[PDB]
Amino acid sequence: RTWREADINYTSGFRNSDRILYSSDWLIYKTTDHYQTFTKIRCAQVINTFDGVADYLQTYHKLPDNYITKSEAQALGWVASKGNLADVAPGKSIGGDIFSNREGKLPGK
Amino acid sequence: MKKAVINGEQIRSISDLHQTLKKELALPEYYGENLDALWDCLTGWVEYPLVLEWRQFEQSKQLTENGAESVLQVFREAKAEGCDITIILS
């Protein structure tokens, strides 16, 4: 199993601490404390954006269109320090990058 | 040219190392102080070039439960991906 990550609840400015994590066998987790802890998306009613994106992922097997990887955002002159993502890529979030599950908190490879 | 200095003998724990990094790399306040967080910041926050001076690197390995190495590996991996990182192990 491989993993990938995308930002959640990003609008403008500096990036936040929320992420959705999804595997190649479509396990899906979320963290709202910048990878400290993870909780399995175990859906229910599609009320919030974690729920929204997880149900998109399960249905289409890809991130919604509002996502670009980090190298794509940089290609457009993204500077995280500045927090100018909404500048060079309006309405976009970072997402889709390989996630190495380095602390081993999510189900192993 | 960002300078980050780790005084290895000062480290009291893995968490203390992340806090030193949060300071030296000027990471956001919500920095998760873990390897996944660190990778996120290296590829999605820190400006380059970066010089990471890690003094008494060898002492820091024991002062962390062998966690210093995995922190080092993340810097190495960012460097391998094309981040302009100079790593000094002293």
UniProtKB/Swiss-Prot annotation, chain B:
- Which GO cellular component does the record give, naming just one? cytoplasm
Question: What is the name attached to this protein's record?
Answer: Barstar
What are the subcellular locations of this protein?
Answer: Cytoplasm
- Job description of the protein: Inhibitor of the ribonuclease barnase. Forms a one-to-one non-covalent complex.
Against Gene3D superfamilies, the record matches this protein to: Barstar-like
Originating organism: Bacillus amyloliquefaciens (Bacillus velezensis)
Enumerate the InterPro entries for this protein: Barstar (IPR000468), Barstar-like_sf (IPR035905)
UniProt record similarity statement: Belongs to the barstar family.
Signal peptide as annotated in the record: none
Q: Cite a single Pfam family from the UniProt record.
A: Barstar
Keywords for this protein:
Cytoplasm
